[model samples]
Target: ATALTNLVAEPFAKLEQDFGGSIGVYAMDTGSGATVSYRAEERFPLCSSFKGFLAAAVLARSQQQAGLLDTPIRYGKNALVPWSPISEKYLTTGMTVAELSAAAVQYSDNAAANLLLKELGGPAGLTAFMRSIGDTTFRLDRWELELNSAIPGDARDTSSPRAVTESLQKLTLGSALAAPQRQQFVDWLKGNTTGNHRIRAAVPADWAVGDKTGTCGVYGTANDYAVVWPTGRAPIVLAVYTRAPNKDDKHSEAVIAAAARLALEGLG
Candidate 1:
């Protein structure tokens, strides 16, 4: 398995070099345990991608607290952060927990994500939740905007591609969250409205795909993770993350999409 994985990773090394950065990829065939890994164990910043798991943590909590998702959060203007289009639009009426969850996942709304983090007891709480689910590599040390800094050599708010894919598989297609919550998580990802140019671009139109994306707006850092259902086959869960050494470096969605294509083709 290691030899095959190494062989599959060869092209990714060249791809990252061409991009003047590091690309981390981890893909798994759920039915066969086949995998393609390149720098999969190396840590990369999570950026806005943590919203998916934030919604999952909310869903997990809803299982214990009845009507949790339906609970309303009416925050003042102070809650409105930059890049919060959806939440800002609903400021006059406020939003329910479920609506906020959807906004966080679908739109990557900053305010919605911050509000959800508050509900989860802050970054430590989210990290604790990930730990509970057996994800030792996942960590959330700060909130939005600040967490998007993507600083060089900083471990805070970072997770490995392998850990992201494994946790995504568990939450979306495995037994990490209960059945209803699991399906709800998958549905939120499927309804994502902001990831058209990332992993979604690499997948076939007929294949069912649910994904979450993140862009740090600096350090040439960005990412996408998804569960893709190819027709007549079991689902594949994958994560692709990239970062460069210089703070002013630019990230390329084309590179990310091409990397995804390689990952899918490698699996085949």
Candidate 2:
């Protein structure tokens, strides 16, 4: 854990020196019970990363209510939001629940998430679901209603680094969902968009990283979270939240990439 923490931390330390700013990084290895954590428990705006929890909640509710993993639902024109790859083209028209979930994680589709939130009984349902899971620190608040409400910043979500890690840990450990369901969720995460070049770029090509990235806009906040399974080594999970200066995507990615690279190399 120490090595891994240093691996991720050293690069960010350098970035702090070069770019002259602060960066927050937190990581843990569930396989080895090792952790490389920094500001990990601090609460930061979740951006779209909250979709991870939403996805889990939606899947869990579906299983509990419908008793099937692949149950389908059609999308309405108002179901999706406008800020996503899938929604802009495919979602604005319509799609299925399964496809929407796929697009939500794979393409980080905001509209898909909005639709899922509505399907899961909206904000109240999501809040009840979180409490049922013993996650007191995580809150959906008003963000649930803001999805299609045309309220700017009204849909903002918040989460602690610790809550994020704990949620992922539970999902990875098969405690958050049924055994088969957990596997399915992991598979969905593994299929996320790959070319963004943030956390993935920090590790070796052959390593496996089941993860998600969230950002509001090029000028908005950014969040990166992942569970990395390094070849022949323990798997590690890292979550970084940044209210980066000028909301520069490249700058934030570079900072996170530096931190992740150090963490992975340090793990050795």
Please name the candidate that would achieve the greatest lDDT relative to the true structure.
1
Q: Model 1: per-residue lDDT, tens digit, 105-208?
A: 99999999999999999999889999998999999999978999999999999999999999999999998888999999999999999889999999999998
lDDT of 2 by residue, 63-130 (tens): 77774335555656665445656766763346667777777777878777777777887766776787
Q: Residue 172 of candidate 2: its Cα lDDT?
A: 65
- Provide the lowest-lDDT 10-residue window in model 2: 147-156
Lowest lDDT 10-residue stretch of candidate 1 = 1-10
Candidate 1 lDDT (Cα, 0 to 1):
0.94
Q: Which segments of candidate 2 are over 4 A away from where they belong?
A: 1-21, 67-71, 88-93, 143-156, 218-220, 245-251
- Residue-level lDDT for 80 in candidate 2: 45
lDDT of 1 at 125: 89
